[PDB]
Design a protein around this ligand. Sequence first.
Ligand code: ZN
Ligand code: ZN
Ligand code: ZN
Ligand code: ZN
Ligand code: ZN
Ligand code: ZN
Ligand code: ZN
Ligand code: ZN
Lengths: 120, 124
Amino acid sequence: PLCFECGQQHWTRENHLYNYQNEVDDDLVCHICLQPLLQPLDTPCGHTFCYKCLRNFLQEKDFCPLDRKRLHFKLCKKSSILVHKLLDKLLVLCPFSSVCKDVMQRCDLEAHLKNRCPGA
Amino acid sequence: EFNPLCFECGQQHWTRENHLYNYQNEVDDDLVCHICLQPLLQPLDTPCGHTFCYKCLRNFLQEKDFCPLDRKRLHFKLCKKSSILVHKLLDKLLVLCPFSSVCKDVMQRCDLEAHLKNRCPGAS
Ligand SMILES: [Zn+2]
Ligand SMILES: [Zn+2]
Ligand SMILES: [Zn+2]
Ligand SMILES: [Zn+2]
Ligand SMILES: [Zn+2]
Ligand SMILES: [Zn+2]
Ligand SMILES: [Zn+2]
Ligand SMILES: [Zn+2]
């Protein structure tokens, strides 16, 4: 029942999971989940969180945790092209370490699993 | 005392021009301004999702009407300051002190101003 895009187990409401080769810069790491950002949203207060993390968080809380400012999900916007580019190229290891020792950009893992990986 | 060096970056430039830095390492091309071809300073985001230096874009839009990457209509007033995270990534780029004859310190870009003010033997 593994995710077909990332090769790991998770709910739809939760992020894909990755095993990153290197230590990712803290500023690309989501404050909520403490993993590198996925589908980043910018807040009006200038902070950035995962779509899924922020959607889930705003069901329970109504303030940005970094600045305590009021936060509405509908006012959050997709982060810039630049930010998405930096996140896409982050290096990950294939989760099927039993057979596969491939290392690739995060945005490329899905195609590897769907088309090429014998472990998937 | 006449036409002195910038107090904040230690290099010679006019106020309408960007600060200047000597980068220690290759900077990721995604953090480089397409207009000036240096690492972004005071990044602004366009409605088309692109990012340029505040001073480069303002100068560019004086006689131009569009985004240099995609030629979509572009107005300076519709541009916005880039996210905190983009600023934070840029701040940590390593630079060399410009006063290379007397000082060999390497530091994060955001720290150069404080270095010149509080530490450098080469500043005035
Ligand atoms: Zn997944
Ligand atoms: Zn997150
Ligand atoms: Zn905030
Ligand atoms: Zn594989
Ligand atoms: Zn300067
Ligand atoms: Zn520029
Ligand atoms: Zn554009
Ligand atoms: Zn110095």
